[PDB]
Amino acid sequence: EPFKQQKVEDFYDIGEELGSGQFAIVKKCREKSTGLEYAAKFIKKRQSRASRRGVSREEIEREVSILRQVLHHNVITLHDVYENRTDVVLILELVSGGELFDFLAQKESLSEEEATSFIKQILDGVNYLHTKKIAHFDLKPENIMLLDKNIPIPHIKLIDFGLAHEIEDGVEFKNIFGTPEFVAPEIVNYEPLGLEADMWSIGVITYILLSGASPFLGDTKQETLANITAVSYDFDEEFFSQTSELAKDFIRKLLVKETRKRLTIQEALRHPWITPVDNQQAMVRRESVVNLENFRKQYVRRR
Amino acid sequence: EPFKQQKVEDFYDIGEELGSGQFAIVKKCREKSTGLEYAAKFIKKRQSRASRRGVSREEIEREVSILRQVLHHNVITLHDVYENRTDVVLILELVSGGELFDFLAQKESLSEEEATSFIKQILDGVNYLHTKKIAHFDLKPENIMLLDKNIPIPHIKLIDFGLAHEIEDGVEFKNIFGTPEFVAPEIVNYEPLGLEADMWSIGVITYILLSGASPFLGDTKQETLANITAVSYDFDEEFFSQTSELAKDFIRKLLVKETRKRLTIQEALRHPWITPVDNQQAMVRRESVVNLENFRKQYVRRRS
Fold first, then answer.
1. What is its main location (chain B)?
2. Which segments within chain A are labelled E, that is strand?
3. Position B235 in a domain
4. What pairs with residue A235 in β-bridges?
5. Residues within 8 A of A (CB atoms), B 169-188 only
6. Which domain holds residue B66?
7. How many domains does chain B have?
8. Which residue is closest to A185 within chain B, CA to CA?
9. Which residues of B touch A99 (CB under 8 A)?
C-alpha cells in the first residue's frame, strides 16, 4: 500500500543531522509546500539476505505499516514515506526535546508523584499500542522522548518502531532482539512473545528512573542474561531508602518471568502507585522521592 | 599479566586503515626497531557498564589472554599490546591476503579435493584451539583470512578472537552472541556451550563453500533462528548436483542439534571426505566440483 517513488529532496529541505543510529540516519527537514518542520529518518536498505549492513524490505514495510496505524499524543506520528535506490526515508514528527531521563537529570528535585506523571504518559502510549495489538518491543530510556524540553511538565513521545510487531492470537512469534538490559526472559529464552514483554521493559525503566540503578545489568552481557533468566534482582537500600512500598510493588509485579502472571498494561494503570485509591497512598507518593543523586551519577556514565 | 602502558606511536609507525568493524579499527603499521610490518587493532574501551559503544575491560583481557596462548601457523599471532586512555591497541600479525571466499570467487575452477585443501587448513587451526581448550565462537568466512593472495594454494589464518572463550570441564558457559547465519542451536536456545559450537559453524561454512547457498539463512532473522532450532535445511539439487555424497555426509554430521552426537574436530579430520580410505573415495572427490557459478553469484551480493 505503497511508498512515494519521488525524490524526497524535491518536496523537503533536508539539513542538520539529528542523531544517526546503526541502520538509520535522522536529519531535520522542512516541507516546502507548508513550511512545517519534520524529522527525516533515512533507513538504509539491505542488499541480499545476510548483509550485516542494512534493513530488509519486509522489516521496513512492517515499521511503516505500524506507524500508519498509530495515532496518539504520546506516540510519534508518520507524515509521509519516500524511497529511492539506497534508502527508504520516513518523514516523521519532529521530536526535539531530548530524552526523558535527560530532562529528569536536570531536575532540582523530583518526588514520586511527579515521577508517576511521566510514567503515566508512557503507560498511556503503551496502552494505545496494546489496544491496537502492537508490541513496541524496544522500550528503553533512549526511545522515550520529549517534544518540548522547556515546559514545566513536558510531553512524552515514544519513538523507534524498528522492533515493533503486531500480535495475533493463534499466531506465535519468537525472535531474539533488543538491548540486554531491558529485555524480558522470554526474549532471552527464545520463548513465544507478546505484549507482556513491553510490561517487563516498563518495570525496568521505572526501577532506573527512581533509583538510578538497573535491576539485572551485570558486568558483562553473560551475567545480565543469567540475571534476567533467574530473575535475580533486589531493592538495595543504598538507592531505595527513600522509595515507597507502592513503587516497589509496581516494579515487583512487572518483573515476573511467567508472562501470564505479569501485569498487563491495563493492570499497571489501575495499580495504586499510578492511581491512588485513598488519601494516605497519595501522600506517601508525594513524600517519597526519586534518588536524583544516584540517578545523575549513572546517567552521566551513559555518554 | 599486563599491557604496556606506553604510547604505541613511539614504537610503531601507524598508517593505512585496513578494515574497521564496530568496536575496533584495524590499521597497517611498522615496528620502528625492526622495520617489520604488523596490523594494529585499536579496540575502543567501554566507559561504565552498558555503554553500547565500547568493549569491557574483562573482555579485552580475555581476547588478549587467548591470543597469548595461541601459536599455530593457521592462527594469527599476537606480537605486542599497548594501551592508553581511549583504546587498548593490539599489535597482531599482518594478514593481508583477504578472505578465503574472496580468493575462491576468483577461481577459474575448483574441485572438492582442492576445496578440502583449504578446509583442512581450517580444521588444523581449529584442532589446535580445541586442544588448548579454546572455542573460537566466531567461525565464519570473514574471519578465515589468507596470508598471501598470490600463491597457488594460499595459507589460511583464523582471526578475530573477540568472542573466543576457554572451556573448562565442570564449568558451564551460556551466552548469546555471533552472527545468526552461523550460530549453532545451543547459542540460540541459551543452552550450555563449548567446543561443539565451532564444528556446527564449520558445517555451515563448508555448505556455502561448496554450493554458494546457506543452510539456515531465511529472509529475516526470525526465520533464520527458527531454521537453526528446527535444524531445517536441505541439499537443493539446483546447487548440489555436482556435490559428492561424501561432502554431504560431512556436512550432515556437523549440522546436528545434539552437541554430544555432533562431530568433534578429531572426528572431522578423520572423516573420509577429508581423509579417504580407498582410491575410489579419492576419485569421487577429485571429480566432484564446487559450484563456483552459484558461489560467485552469492558472494557478489555480499559487497558495497
1. cytoplasm
2. 17-20, 24-30, 37-44, 78-83, 87-93, 134-135, 144-146, 156-158, 165-166
3. yes
4. none
5. 173-177, 179-181, 188
6. 8-94
7. 2
8. B190
9. none
Buried b (16+ CB within 10 A) or exposed e, B74-89: bbbebbbbbbbeebbb
- CATH number assigned to the domain comprising residue A256: 1.10.510.10
* Residue whose grid cell is 545476510: A50
A71 interfacial to chain B (CB closer than 8 Å): no
**Which of B188, B217, B302 is nearest residue A190 as measured by Cβ atoms?**
B188
Of B94, B128, B152, the one marking the end of a domain is B94
B68 close contact with A: CB closer than 8 A? no
Q: Amino acid letter at A4?
A: K
A63 to A24, A59, A114: CA distances (angstroms)? 13, 6, 33
C-alpha to C-alpha distance for B17 and B136, rounded to whole angstroms: 25
Same domain, B124 and B177: yes
CB contact under 8 A, A58 and B219: yes
| Same-domain check for residues A162 and A289 | yes
Do A106 and A50 lie in one domain? The reply is no
Task: For an interface test with B, give the residue of A190, A214, A228 to mutate (most B CBs within 10 A).
Answer: A190
Chain B residues lying within 8 Å of A217, measured CB to CB? 49-50
Cβ separation B220–A47 shorter than 8 A:
no
Does some domain include residue B132? yes
Place of cell 513491553: A198
Same domain, B64 and B178: no
Looking at the structure, tell me whether residues A109 and A43 fall in a common domain.
no
Chain A residues with CB under 8 Å of B222 CB are: 173-175
Residue B78: its H or E element: strand B78-83
Domain contains B168: yes
Domain for residue B3, yes or no? no
**Resolution in angstroms for this experimental structure?**
3.0
CB atoms within 10 A of CB B21: 13
Cβ contact B175–A218 (<8 Å): no
Is position A26 annotated in a ligand binding site? yes
Helix, strand, coil share (%) of chain B residues, nearest 5: 40, 15, 45
User: Are A218 and B176 an interchain contact pair (Cβ–Cβ within 8 Å)?
Assistant: no
Q: Report how this structure was experimentally obtained.
A: X-ray
Whether chain A has a CB inside 8 Å of the CB on B53: the answer is no
Instruction: Decide: A302 and B51 in contact? Cβ < 8 Å.
Output: yes
CA distance between the termini of chain A: 40
- In this structure, which amino acid lies at residue A107? K
Q: Are residues B153 and B266 in the same domain?
A: yes
C-alpha to C-alpha distance for B8 and B41, rounded to whole angstroms? 11
Q: How far apart are CA A261 and CA B234, in angstroms?
A: 41
Collapsed DSSP state (helix, strand, coil) of residue A111: strand
Q: How far is CA A166 from the centre of its chain?
A: 16
CATH classification of the domain holding B18: 3.30.200.20
Verify whether the Cβ–Cβ distance A59 to B220 is below 8 Å.
Answer: yes
Handedness of CA B213, B214, B218, B221 (dihedral sign): negative
- Residue ending a domain, among B28, B61, B94, is B94
The SS3 call for residue A103 is: helix
Residue A195 and residue A278 in one domain? yes
Q: Which amino acid is at B71?
A: L
Q: B147 and B229, same structural domain?
A: yes
Chain A contact for B20 (CB, 8 A cutoff): no
